[PDB]
Structure formats: structure tokens, C-alpha cells
Amino acid sequence: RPTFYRQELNKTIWEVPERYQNLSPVYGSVCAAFDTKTGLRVAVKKLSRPFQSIIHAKRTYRELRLLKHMKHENVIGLLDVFTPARSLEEFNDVYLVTHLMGADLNNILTDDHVQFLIYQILRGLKYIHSADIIHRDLKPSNLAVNEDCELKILDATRWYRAPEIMLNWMHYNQTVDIWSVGCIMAELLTGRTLFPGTDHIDQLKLILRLVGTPGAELLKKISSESARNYIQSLTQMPKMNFANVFIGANPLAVDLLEKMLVLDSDKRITAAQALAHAYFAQYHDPDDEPVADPYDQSFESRDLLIDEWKSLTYDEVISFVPPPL
Numbered sequence: 001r002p003t004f005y006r007q008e009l010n011k012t013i014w015e016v017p018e019r020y021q022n023l024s025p026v027y028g029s030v031c032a033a034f035d036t037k038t039g040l041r042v043a044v045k046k047l048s049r050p051f052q053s054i055i056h057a058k059r060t061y062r063e064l065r066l067l068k069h070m071k072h073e074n075v076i077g078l079l080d081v082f083t084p085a086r087s088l089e090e091f092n093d094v095y096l097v098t099h100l101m102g103a104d105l106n107n108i109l110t111d112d113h114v115q116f117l118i119y120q121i122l123r124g125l126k127y128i129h130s131a132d133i134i135h136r137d138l139k140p141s142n143l144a145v146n147e148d149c150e151l152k153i154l155d156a157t158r159w160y161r162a163p164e165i166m167l168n169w170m171h172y173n174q175t176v177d178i179w180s181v182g183c184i185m186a187e188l189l190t191g192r193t194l195f196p197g198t199d200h201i202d203q204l205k206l207i208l209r210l211v212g213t214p215g216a217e218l219l220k221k222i223s224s225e226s227a228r229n230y231i232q233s234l235t236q237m238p239k240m241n242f243a244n245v246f247i248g249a250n251p252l253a254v255d256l257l258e259k260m261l262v263l264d265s266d267k268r269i270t271a272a273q274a275l276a277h278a279y280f281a282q283y284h285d286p287d288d289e290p291v292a293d294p295y296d297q298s299f300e301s302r303d304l305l306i307d308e309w310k311s312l313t314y315d316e317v318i319s320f321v322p323p324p325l
């Protein structure tokens with residue numbers, strides 16, 4: 001049990017172990033800090049109102065469980081989790097400590113940079129997807145890149161969302177993330193957002209303008225009559241030739257985009273399949289693209305009181321084991 005020191009940052013009081021020094025500000029508030037134990041720069045996130053409602057309390061619990069499970073080089077992992085509280089009764093504040101990453105992918109490329117960056121994302125997604133976890137919100141601001149161009153996955157928003165999440169299909173799979181990667185890859189190659197839509201309707205028109213309106217083989221798999229009516233109403237756009245839209249790009253890169261930006265998610269390439277694509281021949285190492293331990297998601301289907309979620313979160317703070325140096 002370490003000793004804590006109080007401090008006021010951006011009109012909030014931070015109580016953190018003395019082990020973390022020189023706090024500097026950057027869902028919750030985040031501070032950069034120096035960690036005297038590892039000698040490394042860290043990010044300390046103080047959650048805001050972590051147990052205000054059932055939804056917050058479950059969301060706090062979910063976030064701690066996910067971070068505690070991620071042990072992979074291209075996914076953000078948990079260095080430490082702590083509370084100033086000495087008991088469950090006083091437990092009201094949760095802090096999360098992770099590696100401070102240099103910048104996000106948003107604020108920044110040759111084809112070799114794009115290969116390395118997209119390769120690291122797919123490698124992280126393979127790990128995440130193997131544990132039955134879907135990210136659902138992949139976008140450049142959720143991708144941290146240091147000076148070495150080493151990338152970690154963290155955590156408009158609509159520009160990277162899969163068409164089946166736009167239409168609220170209840171049974172989408174992991175490939176909603178592959179769609180996002182496709183949109184990201186296309187932005188890195190061209191400098192431009194692929195689908196910069198102003199709202200949900202406009203967003204889908206821009207998508208269908210590139211990938212074409214869906215054929216009868218995809219229509220026969222849509223369960224919502226209203227969605228089916230809507231889709232068939234809109235004007236028939238032809239599938240464009242990616243080799244023309246992405247003119248001058250590496251043709252292996254165009255080929256991967258065509259396999260990622262597929263409307264039908266049953267036919268969209270997976271992260272593991274994409275890792276073996278020729279586009280990543282330089283980097284692909286099948287002996288060095290691990291999968292994750294199983295992840296118990298059964299709590300997602302539970303309806304519990306705020307104090308029960310809080311209690312379950314307290315247990316996970318106590319049982320936390322720091323990763324090895």
C-alpha cells in the first residue's frame with residue numbers, strides 16, 4: 001500500500017501514488033506523468049463519475065476488464081490501476097495508467113509507411129478478434145503512433161463506421177473493424193477522408209457510390225423490411241473500379257482495399273486473412289502474430305445494481321497484477 005499525494009488539475013483533485021510525478025494535463029480526464037518505478041512516461045486517466053448510474057458503473061467495469069485482458073504489442077495495455085480508497089465503502093474514484101504514446105494517427109506517408117501502419121493494426125485486430133472482442137470505433141484518433149512508427153490500438157465518428165452498424169443490424173460480426181481499417185488505409189494513401197459524410201443518409205450514399213448498390217444475393221440476407229425497402233429505393237450506382245479511384249497506388253494495396261471495403265460483411269476479409277495478403281509480405285510473420293487468451297464476456301448480459309458493479313470493479317482493482325519488467 002503506497003502513499004498518495006493530492007493535487008488540483010483542471011478544477012479536479014488528483015490523488016495518486018507518489019510513484020507518479022510531474023503530472024501535466026492532456027469519460028474522464030487524462031494527465032501525462034513520469035513513473036519513478038519503471039522510469040517511463042505514463043498517461044494517468046482519472047475516470048469521471050465512474051459510478052454515477054448503472055450504465056456508468058457497468059461501463060467502468062467493462063473498461064477495466066478489457067484493459068486488464070490486453071497483453072499485446074499493438075494494443076494498449078494496463079500498466080497500473082489504483083484508487084485512493086482503503087475499502088469498498090470509500091471506493092469512489094478509479095485511475096488507469098498506460099504507456100504515454102507520442103501522437104495519434106490523425107495528425108499524420110509513403111507506401112512503406114502505410115504497409116507498416118496497417119500491418120500493425122491488423123495484427124492488433126487479430127489479437128482482439130480472437131478473444132471475441134469487437135472494437136466498433138476504429139478511427140485515426142483511436143490509433144497511437146510513436147516516433148518509431150510503432151502503433152497501438154486505443155479504446156466525425158461516422159466516417160469510419162461499417163454500413164451494417166449505420167443501419168443498426170443487430171448481428172454484425174468482427175469485420176465491422178475491417179471496414180474501418182479499409183477507410184483508414186484509404187485515407188493514409190490519398191490524404192483525404194474516403195467517406196466524409198454529413199449525416200447517416202449522406203454517409204451511405206458516399207459508400208454506395210464507391211462500392212455499388214447491393215445485388216440480389218446481399219438483399220436476400222437483409223431481415224429488416226424497412227431497410228430492404230430503403231436500399232432498393234435509392235438509385236442503382238455501379239461498383240467503381242478501385243484501380244481507378246486509387247490511381248497510382250501500389251496495386252497490391254488496391255487489391256486489399258477491394259477485399260476490405262465489401263458491402264457484404266460475410267464476404268469481407270478477416271484480420272488474420274488480411275495479414276497473409278501479399279501487401280504485407282515484408283512484415284507478415286505467422287509465428288509472431290499471436291491470439292489472445294479467452295475473455296469472459298458473460299457480464300455483458302447481466303442486469304445488476306450500481307453497488308454490485310462497483311463491488312465487481314473494486315475486486316478487479318485489488319486483483320490487478322502489474323506486468324513484468
Ligand SMILES: Nc1ccc2c(NCc3ccc(F)cc3)nc(-c3ccccc3)nc2c1
Nearest residue numbers: 163164167169214221222223224227231265
Ligand atoms: N449477412 C448479411 C450481410 C450484410 C448485411 C447488411 N449489410 C449492411 C448493408 C448496408 C447497406 C446496404 F445497402 C446493404 C447492406 N445489413 C443487414 C441489415 C439487417 C437488418 C437491418 C439493416 C441491415 N444485414 C446483413 C446481413
